[PDB]
Design a protein around this nucleic acid. Structure first.
Length: 101
DNA sequence: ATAACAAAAG
DNA sequence: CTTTGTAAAT
C-alpha cells in the first residue's frame, strides 16, 4: 500500500498540489481565513506532510503572527470550495517521501 | 500580507 | 505510528 519515492520527482507532485492551494487562497483572500498549503509535523526523524488540509485564522497582534486553528472543513458556508487534494499519507525521511499513491 | 515544533487524539 | 494548537522567509 506504501511507496517510497525520490525527492526531486515527488516535489513536482507536491508543488503542483501546493499551487492549487496558493491559487485558492487568492480566490478567498477577502474571506479572512487561511487554508494552509503545506503543513509539517515532526516525529522520530520523520516529517508528516498535509497539503491543503488545515484551516487557520491568522491575526497579527503586537507585530507577531498568531495562528488560530479552525479545522479541516471550510469555515464559512457559501465561500468557494477548496481544491480536491489527495488525502493520502506523505512522510519525508532521508530525502525521500513515503507515499500511498 | 508561505515555509520548526509539541501533545492529544485517532 | 493525524488533528490540534504554538511559534523565518518571501
Amino acid at each position: 500500500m506504501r511507496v517510497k519515492v525520490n525527492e526531486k520527482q515527488f516535489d513536482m507532485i507536491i508543488d503542483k498540489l501546493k499551487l492549487m492551494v496558493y491559487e485558492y487562497n487568492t480566490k478567498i483572500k477577502e474571506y479572512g481565513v487561511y487554508l494552509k498549503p503545506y503543513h509539517i509535523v515532526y516525529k522520530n526523524s520523520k516529517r508528516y506532510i498535509y497539503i491543503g488540509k488545515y484551516w487557520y485564522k491568522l491575526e497579527k497582534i503586537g507585530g507577531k503572527l498568531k495562528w488560530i486553528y479552525l479545522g479541516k472543513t471550510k469555515p464559512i458556508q457559501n465561500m468557494p470550495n477548496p481544491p480536491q487534494i489527495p488525502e493520502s499519507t506523505i512522510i519525508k525521511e532521508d530525502n525521500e517521501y513515503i507515499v500511498d499513491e
